[PDB]
Amino acid sequence: VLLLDVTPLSLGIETMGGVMTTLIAKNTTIPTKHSQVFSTAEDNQSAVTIHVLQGERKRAADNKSLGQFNLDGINPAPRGMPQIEVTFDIDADGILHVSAKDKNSGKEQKITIKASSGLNEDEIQKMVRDAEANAEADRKFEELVQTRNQGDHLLHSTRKQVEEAGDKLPADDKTAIESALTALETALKGEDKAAIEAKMQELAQVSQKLMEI
Amino acid sequence: LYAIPRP
């Protein structure tokens, strides 16, 4: 065949830390369908927002928003435990159906997005050009986000170990752990990946007695 | 496995 219908830009959702995670790649032939399981970013989360994005940038905010919806009634559970199946399906007429379903509770929500939505030919070409012109910056942002998400979880896991250990943790040690938690917290707000990893290292270096308990 | 934030 010398012609066919494709979806012209990647399609996906926003995931933890402000990144676009792709479910259908640019230039995929239509009709097509893809599903992927996701989970919750923090402990006890009862809801997620599925923000539907079109484009090639790694920052969710730099992509075209096609719509959004919430899924709620998830039983509050530890981060990473809920199994939320997200499905993008584009039919032969370019209509995009997105659904999210929480496996445990069975709760599901969906939206339908018309084929005329999204970026036009000029904006499609500008998106591919802008993505390439910013390829290194976007790679650096993705790595930063990965590191931030790891430190964010190290803040939460460490703090709970402090709780559980209670009196079994020497006051000297709680002191040093507390200050390193605050320094990690501050670093996570910045954009320097090595600074964050360094505060993670400093925190490990005062958590050894906590490690053993 | 990616994670989705709350609304």
Side-chain angles (χ1 to χ4, degrees), chain A residues 24-38:
Chain A
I24 299 171
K26 69 163 180 171
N27 296 312
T28 290
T29 62
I30 62 188
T32 196
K33 173 185 127 99
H34 187 61
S35 304
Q36 179 165 309
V37 182
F38 293 80

PDB file of all heavy atoms in Angstrom, chain A residues 24-38:
ATOM      1  N   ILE A  24       0.744   5.190  22.857  1.00  0.00           N
ATOM      2  CA  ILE A  24       0.791   4.896  21.427  1.00  0.00           C
ATOM      3  C   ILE A  24       1.875   5.793  20.777  1.00  0.00           C
ATOM      4  O   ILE A  24       1.861   7.012  20.913  1.00  0.00           O
ATOM      5  CB  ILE A  24      -0.588   5.146  20.729  1.00  0.00           C
ATOM      6  CG1 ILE A  24      -1.687   4.232  21.338  1.00  0.00           C
ATOM      7  CG2 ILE A  24      -0.509   4.924  19.181  1.00  0.00           C
ATOM      8  CD1 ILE A  24      -3.114   4.486  20.931  1.00  0.00           C
ATOM      9  N   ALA A  25       2.835   5.208  20.048  1.00  0.00           N
ATOM     10  CA  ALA A  25       3.908   6.024  19.493  1.00  0.00           C
ATOM     11  C   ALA A  25       3.434   6.806  18.273  1.00  0.00           C
ATOM     12  O   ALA A  25       2.534   6.376  17.499  1.00  0.00           O
ATOM     13  CB  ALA A  25       5.118   5.144  19.054  1.00  0.00           C
ATOM     14  N   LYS A  26       4.084   7.952  18.045  1.00  0.00           N
ATOM     15  CA  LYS A  26       3.826   8.658  16.768  1.00  0.00           C
ATOM     16  C   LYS A  26       4.005   7.745  15.530  1.00  0.00           C
ATOM     17  O   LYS A  26       4.886   6.862  15.491  1.00  0.00           O
ATOM     18  CB  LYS A  26       4.718   9.855  16.595  1.00  0.00           C
ATOM     19  CG  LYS A  26       6.156   9.558  16.384  1.00  0.00           C
ATOM     20  CD  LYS A  26       6.843  10.821  15.815  1.00  0.00           C
ATOM     21  CE  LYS A  26       8.350  10.509  15.608  1.00  0.00           C
ATOM     22  NZ  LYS A  26       8.994  11.622  14.854  1.00  0.00           N
ATOM     23  N   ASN A  27       3.134   7.992  14.590  1.00  0.00           N
ATOM     24  CA  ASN A  27       3.147   7.367  13.277  1.00  0.00           C
ATOM     25  C   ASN A  27       2.720   5.929  13.343  1.00  0.00           C
ATOM     26  O   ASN A  27       2.874   5.198  12.299  1.00  0.00           O
ATOM     27  CB  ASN A  27       4.466   7.555  12.569  1.00  0.00           C
ATOM     28  CG  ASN A  27       4.756   9.004  12.275  1.00  0.00           C
ATOM     29  OD1 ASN A  27       3.888   9.740  11.761  1.00  0.00           O
ATOM     30  ND2 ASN A  27       5.997   9.396  12.519  1.00  0.00           N
ATOM     31  N   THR A  28       2.088   5.527  14.444  1.00  0.00           N
ATOM     32  CA  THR A  28       1.446   4.170  14.536  1.00  0.00           C
ATOM     33  C   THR A  28       0.219   4.057  13.568  1.00  0.00           C
ATOM     34  O   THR A  28      -0.553   5.020  13.438  1.00  0.00           O
ATOM     35  CB  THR A  28       0.937   3.909  15.988  1.00  0.00           C
ATOM     36  OG1 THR A  28       2.111   3.756  16.795  1.00  0.00           O
ATOM     37  CG2 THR A  28       0.136   2.522  16.029  1.00  0.00           C
ATOM     38  N   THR A  29       0.079   2.921  12.861  1.00  0.00           N
ATOM     39  CA  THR A  29      -1.082   2.837  11.982  1.00  0.00           C
ATOM     40  C   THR A  29      -2.366   2.704  12.777  1.00  0.00           C
ATOM     41  O   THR A  29      -2.434   2.028  13.881  1.00  0.00           O
ATOM     42  CB  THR A  29      -0.964   1.631  10.987  1.00  0.00           C
ATOM     43  OG1 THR A  29      -0.920   0.448  11.783  1.00  0.00           O
ATOM     44  CG2 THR A  29       0.319   1.685  10.265  1.00  0.00           C
ATOM     45  N   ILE A  30      -3.419   3.315  12.259  1.00  0.00           N
ATOM     46  CA  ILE A  30      -4.747   3.135  12.883  1.00  0.00           C
ATOM     47  C   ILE A  30      -5.735   2.299  12.015  1.00  0.00           C
ATOM     48  O   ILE A  30      -5.643   2.319  10.785  1.00  0.00           O
ATOM     49  CB  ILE A  30      -5.399   4.444  13.381  1.00  0.00           C
ATOM     50  CG1 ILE A  30      -5.627   5.372  12.253  1.00  0.00           C
ATOM     51  CG2 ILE A  30      -4.487   5.106  14.472  1.00  0.00           C
ATOM     52  CD1 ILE A  30      -6.107   6.794  12.756  1.00  0.00           C
ATOM     53  N   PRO A  31      -6.657   1.538  12.648  1.00  0.00           N
ATOM     54  CA  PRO A  31      -6.867   1.422  14.098  1.00  0.00           C
ATOM     55  C   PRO A  31      -5.758   0.738  14.908  1.00  0.00           C
ATOM     56  O   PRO A  31      -4.972  -0.025  14.377  1.00  0.00           O
ATOM     57  CB  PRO A  31      -8.122   0.578  14.215  1.00  0.00           C
ATOM     58  CG  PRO A  31      -8.106  -0.282  12.971  1.00  0.00           C
ATOM     59  CD  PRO A  31      -7.436   0.500  11.896  1.00  0.00           C
ATOM     60  N   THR A  32      -5.670   1.084  16.194  1.00  0.00           N
ATOM     61  CA  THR A  32      -4.678   0.468  17.082  1.00  0.00           C
ATOM     62  C   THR A  32      -5.178   0.504  18.487  1.00  0.00           C
ATOM     63  O   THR A  32      -5.974   1.389  18.833  1.00  0.00           O
ATOM     64  CB  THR A  32      -3.358   1.238  16.958  1.00  0.00           C
ATOM     65  OG1 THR A  32      -2.271   0.472  17.511  1.00  0.00           O
ATOM     66  CG2 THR A  32      -3.469   2.672  17.667  1.00  0.00           C
ATOM     67  N   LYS A  33      -4.618  -0.373  19.346  1.00  0.00           N
ATOM     68  CA  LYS A  33      -5.036  -0.297  20.747  1.00  0.00           C
ATOM     69  C   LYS A  33      -3.818  -0.685  21.546  1.00  0.00           C
ATOM     70  O   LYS A  33      -3.007  -1.554  21.129  1.00  0.00           O
ATOM     71  CB  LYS A  33      -6.245  -1.209  20.992  1.00  0.00           C
ATOM     72  CG  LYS A  33      -6.777  -1.429  22.418  1.00  0.00           C
ATOM     73  CD  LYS A  33      -7.902  -2.479  22.392  1.00  0.00           C
ATOM     74  CE  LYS A  33      -7.677  -3.625  23.378  1.00  0.00           C
ATOM     75  NZ  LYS A  33      -8.467  -3.394  24.586  1.00  0.00           N
ATOM     76  N   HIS A  34      -3.620  -0.032  22.669  1.00  0.00           N
ATOM     77  CA  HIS A  34      -2.593  -0.478  23.583  1.00  0.00           C
ATOM     78  C   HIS A  34      -3.055  -0.254  25.020  1.00  0.00           C
ATOM     79  O   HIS A  34      -3.637   0.773  25.335  1.00  0.00           O
ATOM     80  CB  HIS A  34      -1.230   0.195  23.327  1.00  0.00           C
ATOM     81  CG  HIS A  34      -0.091  -0.385  24.173  1.00  0.00           C
ATOM     82  ND1 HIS A  34       0.301  -1.718  24.099  1.00  0.00           N
ATOM     83  CD2 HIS A  34       0.715   0.191  25.103  1.00  0.00           C
ATOM     84  CE1 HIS A  34       1.320  -1.928  24.938  1.00  0.00           C
ATOM     85  NE2 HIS A  34       1.573  -0.785  25.571  1.00  0.00           N
ATOM     86  N   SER A  35      -2.708  -1.209  25.898  1.00  0.00           N
ATOM     87  CA  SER A  35      -2.992  -1.053  27.321  1.00  0.00           C
ATOM     88  C   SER A  35      -1.710  -1.188  28.113  1.00  0.00           C
ATOM     89  O   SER A  35      -0.719  -1.905  27.743  1.00  0.00           O
ATOM     90  CB  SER A  35      -3.926  -2.161  27.788  1.00  0.00           C
ATOM     91  OG  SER A  35      -5.132  -2.251  27.057  1.00  0.00           O
ATOM     92  N   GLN A  36      -1.717  -0.541  29.283  1.00  0.00           N
ATOM     93  CA  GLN A  36      -0.531  -0.634  30.120  1.00  0.00           C
ATOM     94  C   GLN A  36      -1.006  -0.482  31.558  1.00  0.00           C
ATOM     95  O   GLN A  36      -1.864   0.363  31.847  1.00  0.00           O
ATOM     96  CB  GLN A  36       0.482   0.472  29.812  1.00  0.00           C
ATOM     97  CG  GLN A  36       1.752   0.423  30.686  1.00  0.00           C
ATOM     98  CD  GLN A  36       2.899   1.298  30.129  1.00  0.00           C
ATOM     99  OE1 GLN A  36       3.239   1.184  28.935  1.00  0.00           O
ATOM    100  NE2 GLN A  36       3.557   2.079  30.984  1.00  0.00           N
ATOM    101  N   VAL A  37      -0.439  -1.305  32.480  1.00  0.00           N
ATOM    102  CA  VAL A  37      -0.790  -1.096  33.880  1.00  0.00           C
ATOM    103  C   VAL A  37       0.079  -0.050  34.595  1.00  0.00           C
ATOM    104  O   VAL A  37       1.325  -0.050  34.436  1.00  0.00           O
ATOM    105  CB  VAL A  37      -0.659  -2.428  34.650  1.00  0.00           C
ATOM    106  CG1 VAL A  37      -1.079  -2.240  36.122  1.00  0.00           C
ATOM    107  CG2 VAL A  37      -1.493  -3.464  33.913  1.00  0.00           C
ATOM    108  N   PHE A  38      -0.581   0.805  35.379  1.00  0.00           N
ATOM    109  CA  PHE A  38       0.050   1.837  36.200  1.00  0.00           C
ATOM    110  C   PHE A  38      -0.331   1.642  37.642  1.00  0.00           C
ATOM    111  O   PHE A  38      -1.207   0.807  37.910  1.00  0.00           O
ATOM    112  CB  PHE A  38      -0.456   3.267  35.768  1.00  0.00           C
ATOM    113  CG  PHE A  38      -0.015   3.663  34.407  1.00  0.00           C
ATOM    114  CD1 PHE A  38      -0.687   3.182  33.292  1.00  0.00           C
ATOM    115  CD2 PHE A  38       1.114   4.424  34.242  1.00  0.00           C
ATOM    116  CE1 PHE A  38      -0.230   3.462  31.992  1.00  0.00           C
ATOM    117  CE2 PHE A  38       1.582   4.774  32.948  1.00  0.00           C
ATOM    118  CZ  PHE A  38       0.895   4.273  31.824  1.00  0.00           C
TER     119      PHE A  38
END
